[PDB]
Amino acid sequence: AAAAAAAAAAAAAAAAAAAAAAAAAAAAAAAAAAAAAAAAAAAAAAAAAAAAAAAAAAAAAAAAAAAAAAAAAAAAAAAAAAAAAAAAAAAAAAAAAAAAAAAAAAAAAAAAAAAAAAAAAAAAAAAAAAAAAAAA
Amino acid sequence: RPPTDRDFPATIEEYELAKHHQ
Amino acid sequence: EEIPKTPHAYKKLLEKQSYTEERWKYTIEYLFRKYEADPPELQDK
Amino acid sequence: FSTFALNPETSRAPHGPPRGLINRYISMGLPPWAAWCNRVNRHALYRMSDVSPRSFLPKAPHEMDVIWMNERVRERVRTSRQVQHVYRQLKYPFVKTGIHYSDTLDHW
Amino acid sequence: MSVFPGLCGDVATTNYRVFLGTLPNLAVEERFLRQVQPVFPWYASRKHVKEQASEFLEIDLASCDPELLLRYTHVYYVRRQLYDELVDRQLTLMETGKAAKVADSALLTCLAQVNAAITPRLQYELHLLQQAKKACRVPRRRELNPDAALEAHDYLCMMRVVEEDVGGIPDAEMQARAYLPREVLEAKVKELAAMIFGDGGSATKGTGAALERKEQKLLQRMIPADYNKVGAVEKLRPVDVTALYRFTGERVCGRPADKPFARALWGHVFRKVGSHPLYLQRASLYWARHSGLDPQSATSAMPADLATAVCVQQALFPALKYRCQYLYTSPDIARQQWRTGHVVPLLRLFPLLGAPAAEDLAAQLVVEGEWAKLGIEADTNLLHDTVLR
Amino acid sequence: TWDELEPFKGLPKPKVQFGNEAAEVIWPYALLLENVIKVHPYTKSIYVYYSQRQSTPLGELAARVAKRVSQAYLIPITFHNSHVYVEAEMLLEYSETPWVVVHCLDGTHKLIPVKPQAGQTVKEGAEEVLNGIVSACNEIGSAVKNPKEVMRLLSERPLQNQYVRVNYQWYGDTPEERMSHLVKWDYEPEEVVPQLRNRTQHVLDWMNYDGNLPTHNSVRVNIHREAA
Amino acid sequence: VAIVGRMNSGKSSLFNLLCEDPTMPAKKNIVKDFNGITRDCVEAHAALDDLHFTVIDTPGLLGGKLVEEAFRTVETADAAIFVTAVDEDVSAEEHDLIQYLAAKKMPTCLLVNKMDLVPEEEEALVLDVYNRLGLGKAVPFSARKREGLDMLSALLEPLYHIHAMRKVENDWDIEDLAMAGDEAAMEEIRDRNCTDRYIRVAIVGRTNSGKTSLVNRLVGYERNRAADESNTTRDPIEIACMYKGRKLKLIDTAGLARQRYRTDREFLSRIHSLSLNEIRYAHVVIVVFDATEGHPNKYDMSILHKVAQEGRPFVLCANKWDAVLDQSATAEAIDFKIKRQVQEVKYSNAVVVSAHTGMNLTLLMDQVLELYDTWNKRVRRSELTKFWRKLEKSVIIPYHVARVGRITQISTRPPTFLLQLQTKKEESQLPKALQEMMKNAITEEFGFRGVPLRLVQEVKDSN
RNA sequence: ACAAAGAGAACGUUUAUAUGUAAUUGUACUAUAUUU
Ligand SMILES: Nc1nc2c(ncn2[C@@H]2O[C@H](COP(=O)(O)OP(=O)(O)OP(=O)(O)O)[C@@H](O)[C@H]2O)c(=O)[nH]1
């Protein structure tokens, strides 16, 4: 139905984007096709689930507190507005290193069925829960 | 390769070499 | 002197007069733009 | 690998000899690939060495009219799809009507 | 950027974006090198704050050693008041230098660029060329200071204070640590690693070659950063002193004997007259740039509000060492105005070399337990080194 | 937009550098062959190192004679020998004396200091500077230890002078058609064989030879028709 | 998916292992080793272990106009597989084609063909200069040694799983526009409910004009092919889109007399055969020629009689008609030569067309769509018999030419009927004069002149 | 033969090209396929 479609499409959007004209790595081609069969990928299903909300709720809370950090302060913000975002957006861009850490530590395994669905998913939580205290 | 540079002589005409018998 | 029977034989004979009428173009470098302050406009706009 | 082997073993003298033909031709004005001619005897070699061109003039020299500088009518020989027979045909030069303006007598 | 073609031609030129993101390293002073030479407010300003916060990013985590000389910080805080007289002019020199620089050799991407926190370094560079009469004095004299030419020179110079005490070399893990600050030059065939002066005796930071010598060379050092520093600057002085730096500088070829001839193997006179002004300029500004972020407590929220410089080696020791830095320069001046260090054309004979041990020896026993007693002599030397005009 | 190097689009890329980029200047084969420099058969690499800034008024000249030897008297060493790799790199700093670092097939790199005497010229300067290498420093590579082991490398050393661009102006662009006036006997007999699926039938057409063959009957049919 | 066009036949030999269809593998794989053989963007079905998909070619760094035709067929393919020969590794255009692939966002895996030719040791080198290529890990491939498969193209598979899902979603959503309309009404049928048998037209004929010019106009004036208006030139085969009230595929070909054969690559080794093997499988043909020359030459009717002899239906099409001096009733020898002595190919309809002009390309769609309606037409067993006896009542066959009697019950088994002789139990066949005189009668009465050719088969009454 | 290339094609010639039947010709893992 529209369940497995929206259950996979949210877990494949990163895969279809990992082929950013490269498409060829260890897991960036193997562990993407492992979930395509949807076998033994029930941990990787729920793993990247929590990794989205933490990357959208950290995209909605900061973007306000980065639009509000100006409106609330407004002391010299109107004078140095360029130095607020350029610094803040970097911290928003330095969050992207969540991928190079997780696109390697997923490739750093010759992806077996479960021994990769377990030894990687359990890591993507420790890269997600890393953005628990970082959200403080 | 001591020789074999006799081609195009006026255009060539240039060498930097001394013959050694032994 | 020779009548070039071929467009290659002609376009080579052209490269001969370009040596007679522009001898100094070949005797050494035409003008070594390559080896005189190669990145000089890194400075001063 | 397989039937198309070509192992370290050699073909041992596959065909045309080094000077049995290649030097003998090279030393008379012909390329090495000229050895792969169909047949040759002492008079056929005399014809290949081009010692005396086998071409003629259309008219007697004293009565020729069209200016021929170094051109003579030369036959061309092209063979068959195999080497059973050859066709022959005379090959002529281009005779351009020369409309040249001569300065000495002011006219064309 | 053509002043350091050994550095940029070396470092990794990574590329994952249309901008070929080049790769510096925080520890090596290519940070200092990518801010002194350039004239591009783009990168001369950003990596400033990337470094500035990155300390503050790690400052907010580790356990620090601030105000360790707490009784002295108050006596330290008396020079912080009498320094905003010399530092007054020193910005004014660059206040018009940066703006009125309509010329060819040094163009900023905005010649109306107001002086910022980034400006000191790239502007400090321009004042150095000002005092001299030619360009460029530093690499031209990098030609006559080969690396191992100064190693054996700055080694025997240490034995003078402590002979039959060191033995050989500081350990490799320090040698490779002393590698990090020194820039990289052509490793090509049958050449050798020339050296800029700012390697030798730069009083900008703990950044002199011979300055790097003492802070680990002598064995009479202990965890108290005093015995290190009071003699650290003792090694700082000679290698910047004109009268020796020329007496000690031989040609690139004199080191391996590659040319049986040289226009003058010995380092010329009329050029080492620049390194010492390069060493003595911004003397008061040097203090403020350290004092500004010497106390770790103030460091937490002072810098971005105060006109001062920031680096990475600040974090190595917040105020145990870098506020003990406020100390060594006080017996420093107390030597050159007492043992006549500035104007000596010869400073190599044993009595001259046997004196600096006493300048420590008469100070270490004081700084041992009677810290308050050493303060006064250490206080006067700061009205002395700098005159108001 | 004109791809000036459209013939050399398949050749390797030279070691692109600051004073080594004049290895991709399109050399006319008539400017080459004006300098046929034949270095000792036991020479592996020739290196020239000069500077961009010089202070000493003689150093400003020494960095010029070494400059010219890179332009003129270095690539002919590559083009002709083809077992000598040649690299002239300028170091962007003050200096006095440029270097010349010549390697040998043993691994014995030697020293050549470019010290031109004061009253010399940039032309005479090179001849003194080049001779110091071609004779004094390369002919002394004939003191090799094992004259065989250091030879099998020469018969193994792949041709280094591919990257160079020669414009064989009006000369032929192919090694044989360039000669074109010399009998060779350098051919290897197997290579000369045609192998064109009807050899001795095309070969007879090229050199226009019948081969003792008989004329087709179509010939007398036409001669009978070319009568009167 | 689409292969890229570094100049060789590996992008053409990677196609080799992927071509699936009934009874005749469409071995388009012209792999002659002469630095680029494929000229046009040839596409065809593919099949690895499970994943079906359409591989495409993008050839032609050769002619200053010819690379552009790929740019159309590189954008329609939602993927690409850059292939690199280990002969030459890194170059200029093989790099500008990566900065391009990145410019257009299309994904791509890099695989390296001819991974023979390298020793067991010198592989760290060949591989590394390819990982640094930006495309990521180059994955080892070899068509000769049939490795580089089940581990290379069975790993592009992620794309197929996603592409199956992006389609079905569009099915969920192009259905939301199914109501009026203007489109998407029967377009929901043309995708899934449309179940025809793919009328396979074929534009055959001698190749002097870029006679795919005509194919291009019909496909959308679109220039999916190379107009070889330069001189006598070459194409490889092609297949294109399918509409005109049905699903009608188009192909392209080439044709010359055996004597004209120039060596091979023009005939017995490949092209003349590679074009005739695709008119033995072609539900219609269009024997195109160039009207400007005038009457169709002696061989231009030999393409008909072969199609006539293949049960196929045929049309004539005088392309380049506007460039003629409007020679109706003068260049109407095309409507006479097909009548003078041509045996059964006559009754054919010779349409008239010009590509640039568009002269009748719509009327041309009607002839082909009609012929396939006559190429499938069954007559009631009764209506035939009650018609032949009325023939045999008036024919001048004097029964010595044909001792055969009343052709008892002519039935029609398929496109072509069978004859059953009057209780003869004797010599079976009928003469050629009395053979066509039967087929001449049929096409007239029933209107079979769409395909004027049937295969009449004879048999006696058994015992 | 014609067109094509080649020569600032007033024409003369030498190559590359499919036309007419012009017109002569001829066409009954050791196995178990193949020579039409
Ligand atoms: N150049 C051009 N294309 C057109 C025009 N009208 C439609 N097209 C489109 O370009 C092609 C032209 O052919 P069509 O109009 O389709 O007509 P057709 O050739 O009879 O048949 P199909 O192409 O099979 O539909 C098709 O892709 C059309 O959709 C037009 O006026 N000019």
PDB file of N, CA, C and O (backbone and C1' of nucleotides) in Angstrom, chain G residues 206 232 256 260 262 297-298, chain H residues 4 16-21:
ATOM      1  N   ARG G 206      17.401   2.243 -50.148  1.00  0.00           N
ATOM      2  CA  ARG G 206      18.794   2.574 -50.390  1.00  0.00           C
ATOM      3  C   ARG G 206      19.181   3.805 -49.583  1.00  0.00           C
ATOM      4  O   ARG G 206      18.374   4.711 -49.370  1.00  0.00           O
ATOM      5  N   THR G 232      27.207   9.391 -49.006  1.00  0.00           N
ATOM      6  CA  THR G 232      26.800   8.027 -48.697  1.00  0.00           C
ATOM      7  C   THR G 232      27.430   7.615 -47.373  1.00  0.00           C
ATOM      8  O   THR G 232      28.654   7.515 -47.244  1.00  0.00           O
ATOM      9  N   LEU G 256      21.936  -2.043 -50.008  1.00  0.00           N
ATOM     10  CA  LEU G 256      22.748  -1.879 -51.239  1.00  0.00           C
ATOM     11  C   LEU G 256      22.943  -3.209 -51.967  1.00  0.00           C
ATOM     12  O   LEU G 256      22.856  -4.253 -51.316  1.00  0.00           O
ATOM     13  N   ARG G 260      27.748  -4.084 -54.969  1.00  0.00           N
ATOM     14  CA  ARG G 260      28.186  -2.781 -54.401  1.00  0.00           C
ATOM     15  C   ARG G 260      28.901  -3.008 -53.082  1.00  0.00           C
ATOM     16  O   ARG G 260      29.440  -2.031 -52.548  1.00  0.00           O
ATOM     17  N   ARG G 262      31.162  -2.982 -50.288  1.00  0.00           N
ATOM     18  CA  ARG G 262      32.546  -2.468 -50.158  1.00  0.00           C
ATOM     19  C   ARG G 262      33.119  -3.214 -48.964  1.00  0.00           C
ATOM     20  O   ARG G 262      32.717  -2.922 -47.831  1.00  0.00           O
ATOM     21  N   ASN G 297      15.062   2.848 -58.908  1.00  0.00           N
ATOM     22  CA  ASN G 297      15.986   2.074 -59.711  1.00  0.00           C
ATOM     23  C   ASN G 297      15.676   0.583 -59.591  1.00  0.00           C
ATOM     24  O   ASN G 297      14.887   0.149 -58.751  1.00  0.00           O
ATOM     25  N   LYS G 298      16.310  -0.204 -60.467  1.00  0.00           N
ATOM     26  CA  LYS G 298      16.015  -1.632 -60.562  1.00  0.00           C
ATOM     27  C   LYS G 298      16.071  -2.318 -59.207  1.00  0.00           C
ATOM     28  O   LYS G 298      15.300  -3.246 -58.951  1.00  0.00           O
TER      29      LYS G 298
ATOM     30  P     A H   4      28.112  16.691 -59.798  1.00  0.00           P
ATOM     31  O5'   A H   4      28.930  15.759 -58.804  1.00  0.00           O
ATOM     32  C5'   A H   4      28.369  15.365 -57.565  1.00  0.00           C
ATOM     33  C4'   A H   4      29.390  14.718 -56.663  1.00  0.00           C
ATOM     34  C3'   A H   4      30.709  15.443 -56.491  1.00  0.00           C
ATOM     35  O3'   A H   4      30.636  16.560 -55.627  1.00  0.00           O
ATOM     36  C1'   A H   4      31.101  13.132 -56.772  1.00  0.00           C
ATOM     37  P     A H  16      40.542   5.422 -55.390  1.00  0.00           P
ATOM     38  O5'   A H  16      38.963   5.537 -55.244  1.00  0.00           O
ATOM     39  C5'   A H  16      38.321   5.139 -54.036  1.00  0.00           C
ATOM     40  C4'   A H  16      37.186   6.066 -53.692  1.00  0.00           C
ATOM     41  C3'   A H  16      35.783   5.531 -53.960  1.00  0.00           C
ATOM     42  O3'   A H  16      35.254   4.790 -52.874  1.00  0.00           O
ATOM     43  C1'   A H  16      36.023   7.625 -55.010  1.00  0.00           C
ATOM     44  P     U H  17      33.811   4.081 -52.991  1.00  0.00           P
ATOM     45  O5'   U H  17      32.757   5.284 -52.997  1.00  0.00           O
ATOM     46  C5'   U H  17      31.354   5.046 -52.958  1.00  0.00           C
ATOM     47  C4'   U H  17      30.634   5.765 -54.072  1.00  0.00           C
ATOM     48  C3'   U H  17      29.435   5.040 -54.676  1.00  0.00           C
ATOM     49  O3'   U H  17      28.235   5.300 -53.954  1.00  0.00           O
ATOM     50  C1'   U H  17      30.840   5.935 -56.393  1.00  0.00           C
ATOM     51  P     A H  18      27.347   4.119 -53.307  1.00  0.00           P
ATOM     52  O5'   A H  18      26.618   3.437 -54.544  1.00  0.00           O
ATOM     53  C5'   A H  18      25.828   2.267 -54.366  1.00  0.00           C
ATOM     54  C4'   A H  18      24.789   2.139 -55.446  1.00  0.00           C
ATOM     55  C3'   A H  18      24.661   0.747 -56.057  1.00  0.00           C
ATOM     56  O3'   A H  18      23.289   0.348 -56.243  1.00  0.00           O
ATOM     57  C1'   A H  18      25.250   2.327 -57.743  1.00  0.00           C
ATOM     58  P     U H  19      22.226   1.104 -57.194  1.00  0.00           P
ATOM     59  O5'   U H  19      22.632   0.692 -58.676  1.00  0.00           O
ATOM     60  C5'   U H  19      21.636   0.526 -59.671  1.00  0.00           C
ATOM     61  C4'   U H  19      21.381   1.809 -60.423  1.00  0.00           C
ATOM     62  C3'   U H  19      20.937   1.646 -61.870  1.00  0.00           C
ATOM     63  O3'   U H  19      19.536   1.536 -61.971  1.00  0.00           O
ATOM     64  C1'   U H  19      22.720   3.204 -61.742  1.00  0.00           C
ATOM     65  P     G H  20      18.868   0.409 -62.887  1.00  0.00           P
ATOM     66  O5'   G H  20      19.115   0.904 -64.374  1.00  0.00           O
ATOM     67  C5'   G H  20      18.027   0.989 -65.286  1.00  0.00           C
ATOM     68  C4'   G H  20      18.297   0.206 -66.544  1.00  0.00           C
ATOM     69  C3'   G H  20      18.621  -1.272 -66.317  1.00  0.00           C
ATOM     70  O3'   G H  20      17.983  -2.161 -67.252  1.00  0.00           O
ATOM     71  C1'   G H  20      20.430  -0.194 -67.421  1.00  0.00           C
ATOM     72  P     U H  21      17.835  -1.869 -68.829  1.00  0.00           P
ATOM     73  O5'   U H  21      17.241  -3.227 -69.393  1.00  0.00           O
ATOM     74  C5'   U H  21      17.558  -4.471 -68.780  1.00  0.00           C
ATOM     75  C4'   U H  21      18.970  -4.904 -69.086  1.00  0.00           C
ATOM     76  C3'   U H  21      19.161  -6.409 -69.270  1.00  0.00           C
ATOM     77  O3'   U H  21      20.146  -6.647 -70.273  1.00  0.00           O
ATOM     78  C1'   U H  21      20.501  -5.650 -67.471  1.00  0.00           C
TER      79        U H  21
END
